[PDB]
Ligand binder design. Structure first.
Ligand SMILES: O=C(O)C1=C[C@@H](O)[C@@H](O)[C@H](O)C1
Length: 179
């Protein structure tokens, strides 16, 4: 049906916790008639444990080693839209897999909106802290250049229909390519 887009590369969404990666990703996949996967959810599926449990029992290092293995595998698939984890771009091998194996889109999201969308979400181990706003801010200061460097496209998002943002991303990508 949208076999029309079968030769379009994988699309990889990057950005912080609360960027709407999975809601936008799933709409973008539906628009393209292809698969959608969330690497956070795939890590949980493959491990049989939640991400808080991985962080507690294996540390952040054990989460990163599991995440890199999953990303290596998922970026080798075809016809995918992938929502990546918020800290996936902290590791050099992941930056390379993403940049070199499809189209990377950075969902730039202000801290205010990250905060609202992760409000009392206990599944985000890094935000289980007294001051989650400062944490998000600190994380963004570090990771914003990394999101931008891996990204082919950056879209400065804001409160809205995830499906409107998915449309916009698809327009951006094709704008380039159809001329
Ligand atoms: O910002 C981060 O480093 C993380 C974001 C989440 O998507 C998970 O991938 C995990 O909680 C770590």
């Amino acid at each position: 049906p949208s076999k029309a887009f079968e030769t379009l590369p994988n699309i990889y969404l990057v950005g912080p916790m609360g960027a709407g990666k999975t809601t936008v990703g799933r709409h973008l996949a539906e628009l393209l008639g292809r698969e959608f996967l969330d690497s956070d959810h795939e890590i949980e599926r493959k491990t049989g444990a939640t991400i808080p449990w991985i962080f507690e029992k294996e540390g952040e290092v054990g989460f990163r080693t599991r995440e890199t293995v999953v990303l290596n595998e998922l970026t080798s698939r075809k016809a995918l839209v992938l929502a990546t984890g918020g800290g996936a771009i902290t590791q050099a091998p992941n930056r390379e897999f993403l940049k070199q194996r499809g189209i990377v889109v950075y969902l730039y999201t202000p801290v205010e909106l990250q905060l609202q969308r992760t409000y009392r979400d206990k599944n985000r181990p890094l935000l289980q802290v007294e001051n989650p706003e400062q944490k998000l801010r600190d994380l963004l200061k570090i990771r914003d250049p990394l999101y931008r460097e891996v990204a082919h496209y950056t879209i400065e998002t804001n409160q809205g229909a995830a499906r409107d943002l998915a449309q916009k991303i698809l327009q951006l990508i094709l704008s380039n390519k159809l001329k």
